[PDB]
């Protein structure tokens, strides 16, 4: 369950968006200084406090109980755009049943006169566009000229979104999840498919330059603020470690259960899966740049279509493309459906824990599933429009993988270390795990993760650069404002809860602070 679209889809395009080589240095810096400490942190908070989500910050500093509300906002927005990823994957899966895949050859209705098939491009020398980018942008995306031009609601993307939301409704509380078929399927089938796509990509001609672009850093790119924050929020994204999902996972664990080796195994496996998927996709992109005669950084989308360009293009250069296209997009749907089952189950669980007996279990709980799925549908219908990828990129940069993740991780590490105490928390960990954490975890919660999150947060503001889609489209200022509103809807869940809890507690400021930072 640490394998998913955040590994096989998000880390490749975030690496491609940030120059490839220079993305990995803040990636590993955040993975070691920040990401695995916060992973162990929320798993321990979910294990210590027997509940999770909001009411786990009741025996851990009740003043900062807004971390749960921040996680609820984050998981709602993540549910919306992560299910529209699944809608794109379903649209590709239904288009995979053709013998000749529509992104393989050049003569269709959506293709421009500037089309050329990929193997023919090196013979002709330059304003010539590959069929994978053409199929993506003008059949799947049906991409408009901006977010201020939404175009029209594209049909059958809404039907793919309806299919994946009906599968989510019929498998979360009207049904069950995978229990006995987890062996040899849905746990190693994505790893097998990643192995197949990796051994395809590494044996491709010209794929050495793609690995060179992937691994060798650009030191001048490390001074960009976007690289550090993209790497940090990619670590916090693929771990889902500002989400409440891992806190809810720790609630379904025993008290004296060893959850250190499990956490570092899951985190290192997740980051290694991301690294292997990056190897695969960037080898495919090196092959693509070799074939098309264009630069490696300009061969495909510098946005969230890289897994929908590089992987389908490698499926075309594979024996029997139809079979592997069907298996690959069923794999994408299985990864994203498992992660969406986990996150919608966590959102539903923490929302009915937020209001007990306002939603009774049984008849009215089932109505609440339909209500929340319908609301996330109507918020997801602005992403299957013509200009729906711009809304999606706004969500992916801002809603659940931006300064909100840095804010929640910094506030969790700060609350634990400097209000709850690293020594008191280590005493709790010793009582549960068996040993108190070493100086790595202690000084990461105390120094390294607050310093990294605060430094990248201020570095993304002093040298502010606007969000750009595919390196060419500058976003409008109202779109940046809407994305910042999406970020601040999670970010302001902490100080609004602080102000509310200070207002609802009587006494002077010192007495209120003392009552609300002493645990219950």
């Amino acid at each position: 369950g640490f394998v998913g679209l955040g590994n096989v889809w998000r880390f490749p395009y975030l690496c491609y968006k940030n120059g490839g080589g220079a993305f990995l240095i803040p990636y590993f810096i955040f993975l070691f200084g920040s990401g695995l400490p916060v992973f162990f942190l929320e798993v321990i908070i979910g294990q210590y406090t027997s509940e999770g989500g909001i009411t786990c910050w009741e025996k851990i500093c009740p003043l900062f109980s807004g971390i749960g509300y921040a996680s609820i906002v984050i998981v709602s927005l993540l549910n919306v755009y992560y299910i529209v990823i699944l809608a794109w994957a379903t649209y590709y899966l239904f288009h995979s049943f053709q013998k000749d895949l529509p992104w393989a050859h050049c003569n269709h209705s959506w293709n421009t006169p500037q089309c050329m098939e990929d193997t023919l491009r090196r013979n002709e020398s330059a304003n010539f566009t590959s069929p994978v980018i053409e199929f993506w942008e003008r059949n799947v995306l049906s991409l408009s000229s901006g977010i201020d031009n939404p175009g029209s609601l594209k049909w059958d993307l809404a039907l793919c979104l309806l299919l994946v939301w009906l599968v989510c409704f019929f498998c979360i509380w009207k049904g069950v999840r995978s229990t006995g078929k987890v062996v040899y399927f849905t746990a190693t089938f994505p790893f097998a498919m990643l192995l197949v796509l990796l051994v395809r990509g590494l044996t491709l001609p010209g794929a050495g330059e793609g690995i060179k672009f992937y691994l060798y850093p650009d030191i001048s790119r490390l001074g960009d603020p976007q690289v550090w924050i993209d790497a940090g929020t990619q670590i916090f994204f693929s771990y889902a470690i500002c989400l409440g999902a891992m806190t809810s996972l720790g609630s379904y664990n025993k008290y004296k259960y060893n959850s250190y080796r499990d956490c570092m195994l899951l985190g290192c496996l997740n980051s290694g899966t991301s690294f292997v998927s990056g190897f695969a996709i960037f080898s495919i992109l090196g092959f693509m740049a070799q074939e098309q005669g264009v630069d490696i950084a300009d061969v495909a989308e510098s946005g969230p279509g890289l897994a929908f360009i590089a992987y389908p293009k490698a499926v075309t250069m594979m024996p029997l493309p139809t079979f592997w296209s069907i298996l690959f997009f069923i794999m994408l749907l299985l990864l994203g459906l498992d992660s969406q089952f986990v996150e919608v189950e966590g959102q539903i669980t923490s929302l009915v824990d937020l209001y007990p007996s306002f939603l009774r279990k049984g008849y009215r709980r089932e109505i609440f599933i339909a209500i929340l799925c319908s609301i996330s549908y109507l918020l997801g219908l602005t992403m299957v429009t013509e200009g729906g990828m711009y809304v999606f990129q706004l969500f992916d940069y801002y809603a659940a993988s931006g300064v909100c993740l840095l804010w929640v991780a910094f506030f969790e590490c700060f609350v634990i270390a400097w209000i709850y105490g690293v020594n008191r928390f280590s005493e709790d960990i010793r009582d549960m795990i068996g040993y108190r954490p070493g100086p790595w975890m202690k000084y990461s919660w105390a120094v390294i993760t607050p310093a990294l999150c605060v430094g990248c947060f201020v570095f993304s503001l002093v040298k502010y650069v606007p969000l750009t889609y595919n390196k060419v489209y500058r976003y409008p200022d109202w779109a940046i404002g809407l994305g910042w509103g999406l970020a601040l809807s999670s970010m302001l869940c902490i100080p609004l809860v602080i102000v509310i809890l200070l207002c609802r507690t009587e006494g002077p400021l010192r007495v209120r602070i003392k009552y609300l930072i002493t645990p219950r």
Partner: antibody
Amino acid sequence: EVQLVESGGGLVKPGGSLKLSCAASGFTFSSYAMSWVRQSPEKRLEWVAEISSGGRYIYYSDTVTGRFTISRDNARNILHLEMSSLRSEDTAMYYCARGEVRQRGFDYWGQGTTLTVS
Amino acid sequence: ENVLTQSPAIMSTSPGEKVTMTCRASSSVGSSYLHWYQQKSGASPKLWIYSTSNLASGVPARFSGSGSGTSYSLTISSVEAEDAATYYCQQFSGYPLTFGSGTKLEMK
């Protein structure tokens, strides 16, 4: 060098009280959980009580679960063991044992103070 | 309680002989939490083997430990005159922490 020095060893009446005092040195006392282990005169080791590093999580054996009280002094590095309702079958040889990692066990033990019931 | 029934206390073995001693537990110990202590005659116990295999500081390499779950074993490759003491096995996972019985190694 880790040194655990015990005190308070003496003869007490049944149903009485005694103050044991494990004075530790050579290590930070606030970061290691400490335990009292007694040894019966027929040489049978028995863990009595464990206190955590901060003094918050306190565990007791089934024999002494309601009449023994273990506490620390993290400022001056002394572990205590208060006693009351001390029955006849409590004459033993009491060691203070430093066990913080549950997978390392009691790596450092103390010196010997004898409790005698008569 | 997790009663650790250990090998009988009175074992008499000549020096230089490979010896072993068992430690059966009533419950199941997680095999990273069972430790062995060597208490000499009239002296305090000291940590000898921790996490059922690793060797404590000042312990020679001739001692070794094995076993998991229920049955746990301490093994001496060759016995010398400084190995004449009582060995207690000790789970330290379950919160009523229990030591084993005696296993006193006397000479011949």
